[PDB]
Structure 1
Amino acid sequence: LKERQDRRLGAFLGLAVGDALGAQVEGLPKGTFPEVREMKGGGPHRLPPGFWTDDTSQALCLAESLLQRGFDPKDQMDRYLRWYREGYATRRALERYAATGDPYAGDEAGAGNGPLMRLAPLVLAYENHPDLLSLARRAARTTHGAREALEATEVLAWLLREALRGAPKEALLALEPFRGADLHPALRRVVEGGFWEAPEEGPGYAPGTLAAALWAFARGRDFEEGMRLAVNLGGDADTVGAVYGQLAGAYYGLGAIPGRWLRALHLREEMEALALALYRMSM
């Protein structure tokens, strides 16, 4: 069904849409700037409208790696490194890998949201794998090693899988499998309802990023409304937007994402092809 493909395309393109939109106001304190509603580009990097950042770049790298050779963390890092060296915590991980050959180069200080911003591709291709959560943890470990970042990635992997399978918003927010689970205290507070309150800003800390995305998803009645709530929190807006985009994209579907946002999106067609290829792979 196109209905099923629509969810996978939505999750992938939603990630990029959130990255591009949020990038326009990243670094700005909440409530100090005009409400973001359109793909105008700009931000600290004077981005053209619809242009995303490293969040989506890493997602693309992971997607190509998966389609090229299944789950291969070594290949993932080869691609990240190559992407990194072609341009001018993660950089430390990439250099660690370059020097030692260890693909799981993340350290305990890496509690950032990097693993969350690029996740979608993994779930699209390995949605039905019995070890999906373990694969997600390994995919996070390549650049981040903090307990809360690894667990936050597992929670997002579960969320995406369930959304792709048609689980209702209430079930996704209930996070039943994680209730009472032995998680890092910060993440436990999120799973137990910390996300119902509006964040003071878009957090860069993994648990906080997930909480901000869940909050926007909980309050937004559709993809667009939730996306605007997410990015207007300011702070790490491109990444909070990217995480929200993945969840909301999988939940609402590509057809629910504002057409003008998709038409302005850089490499829209390339991503749609990748998303479809990954989905075919999961079957």
Structure 2
Amino acid sequence: KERQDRRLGAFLGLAVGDALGAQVEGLPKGTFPEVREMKGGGPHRLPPGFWTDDTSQALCLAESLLQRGFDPKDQMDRYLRWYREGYATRRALERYAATGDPYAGDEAGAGNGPLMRLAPLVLAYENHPDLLSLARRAARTTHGAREALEATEVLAWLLREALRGAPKEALLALEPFRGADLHPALRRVVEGGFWEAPEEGPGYAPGTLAAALWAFARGRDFEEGMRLAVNLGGDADTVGAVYGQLAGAYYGLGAIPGRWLRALHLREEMEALALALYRMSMAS
């Protein structure tokens, strides 16, 4: 159960962070009382425990992986179907709808969207030799900027190592990326830019990753780090979700506040998905 706990933690942690962060999405840091509980709210009056369309994407990706392995075309079919059933990423979806090209992300897409759906992929392809390559392809479906693709690869590595029990010190050391040829902004993050508290929750991929790493570094447990992450305001839903995936894999499901999990929308459905993805990683 110890091992399963890490996979469930990474998956549910993503949703928990998305739900909590959504409560203060768009608010400047230090202009609102400390967020500590699942109260819902935010610009979209979300009910307590409800998450954003981004977690919806992670769920679609999870289902795609379980049904037909790594299939970017199917991933986009699902995102598009979900997109139209509702009322940079939409541009990617419309590009795919018109051209059939699954890797519809453009060079202008340096946003943090791809970081929102890492967990599902790593849970299922943890042991695949081309994991980082798969992560890059999954990011390319909606975002094409160098730094967004590389940030996704770094998070993929972080999650794989965390799931394998790597210590916090090793995760933050980011050894394989030190001296690597990365976009300048991401290089600054890997070299220690995350040790300093950010002035807000960034929407830019490298900045979002740095904010999550900062919260992970300073937090002593899942709850403390999560609160640090979401209280940065800004794109708190995504920063919270990125922190949630990493901290969830590191601390485990059992370490996530029970009241947050009990309030979480589709908790049971996600637990089932997480376990199924983990099972898939241990099979053929």
- TM-score normalised by length of structure 2: 0.99
Please list the CA deviations of residues 71-104 of structure 1 after superposition, one character each: whole Å capped at 9, or x if unmatched.
Answer: 0000000000001000001000000000000000
In structure 1, the partner of 2:59 is: 60
Structure 2: distance between partners of 1:211 and 1:83: 30
State the 1:58 CA deviation: 0.6
- Equivalent residue runs for 1:60-79 within 5 Å: 60-79=59-78
Q: Secondary structure at the match of 2:43?
A: helix
Q: Quote the offset at 1:211 in angstroms.
A: 0.1
The whole-number CA distance in structure 1 between the counterparts of 2:179 and 2:263 is 43
The alpha carbon displacement at 1:119 in A equals 1.0
Q: CA separation in 1, counterparts of 2:224 and 2:82?
A: 33
Deviations 1:156-196 (CA, angstroms, capped at 9, x unpaired):
00000000000000000000000000000000000000000
Q: Please say if residues 105 and 144 of structure 1, whose CA atoms lie closer than 8 Å, have aligned partners that are also in contact.
A: yes
| 261-270 or 50-59: bigger deviation | 50-59
CA offset digits 1:121-164 (Å, max 9, x no partner): 00000000000000000000000000000000000000000000
Q: Distance in 2 between matches of 1:90 and 1:264?
A: 29
Work out whether 1:99 is the aligned partner of 2:102. no
Q: Compute the displacement of 1:55 (Å).
A: 1.7
Query: How much has 1:54 moved relative to structure 2?
Result: 1.4
Inter-partner Cα distance in structure 1 for 2:226 and 2:53: 19
Contact 1:103 1:142 in 2 (8 A): yes
Q: Deviations over 1:169-226 (max 9, x none)?
A: 0000000000000000000000000000000000000000000000000000000000
SS at match of 1:166: coil
Q: 2 CA distance for matches of 1:178 and 1:48?
A: 40
Query: Displaced runs of 4+ in structure 1, greater than 6 A?
Result: none
- The correspondence of residues 182-261 of structure 1 with structure 2, limited to 5 A, is 182-261=181-260
Maintained 8 Å contact 1:125/1:278: yes
CA contact (8 A) 1:18 1:238 kept: yes
Contact 1:186 1:207 (C-alpha < 8 Å) held by counterparts:
yes
Report if aligned partners of 1:66, 1:125 keep a CA contact under 8 Å in 2. yes
> Aligned partners of 1:119 and 1:56: how far apart in 2?
11
Structure 2 residue aligned with 1:276: 275
C-alpha separation in 2, matches of 1:110 and 1:242 = 19
Q: Distance in 2 between matches of 1:41 and 1:124?
A: 28
Structure 2 residues not aligned, in runs of 5+: none
CA distance in 1, matches of 2:159, 2:53: 21
Match in the other structure for 1:109: 108
What's the offset of the Cα at 1:9? Answer: 0.1
Written as runs of structure 1 = structure 2, the 5 A alignment for 1:142-181 is: 142-181=141-180
CA distance in 1 between counterparts of 2:10 and 2:78 reads 22
- Paired with 1:142 and 1:42, the residues of 2 have a C-alpha distance of 30
1:5-51 CA-partner distances (Å, limit 9, x unpaired): 00000000000000000000000000000100000000000000000
Distance across 2 between alignment mates of 1:82 and 1:36: 34
| Aligned counterpart, 1:134 | 133
What is the rounded CA distance, in whole Å, between the counterparts of 1:187 and 1:55 in structure 2?
A: 23
Identity %: 100
Determine if contact 1:7/1:254 at 8 Å carries over to the other structure: yes
Contact 1:15–1:56 (CA<8 Å) still a contact in 2?
yes
Q: What displacement does 1:118 show? A: 1.2
Contact 1:55–1:242 (CA<8 Å) still a contact in 2?
no
Residue aligning to 2:87: 88
Please list every run of 5 or more consecutive structure 1 residues that lacks an aligned counterpart in the other structure.
Answer: none
Q: How far apart, CA to CA, are the structure 1 residues paired with 2:52 and 2:106?
A: 23
Q: How many pairs were matched up?
A: 282
Cα drift, residue 276 of structure 1: 0.1
Residues 104 and 143 in structure 1, CA contact (< 8 A), matched pair in contact too = yes
Q: Is the 8 A contact 1:25 1:43 kept in 2?
A: yes
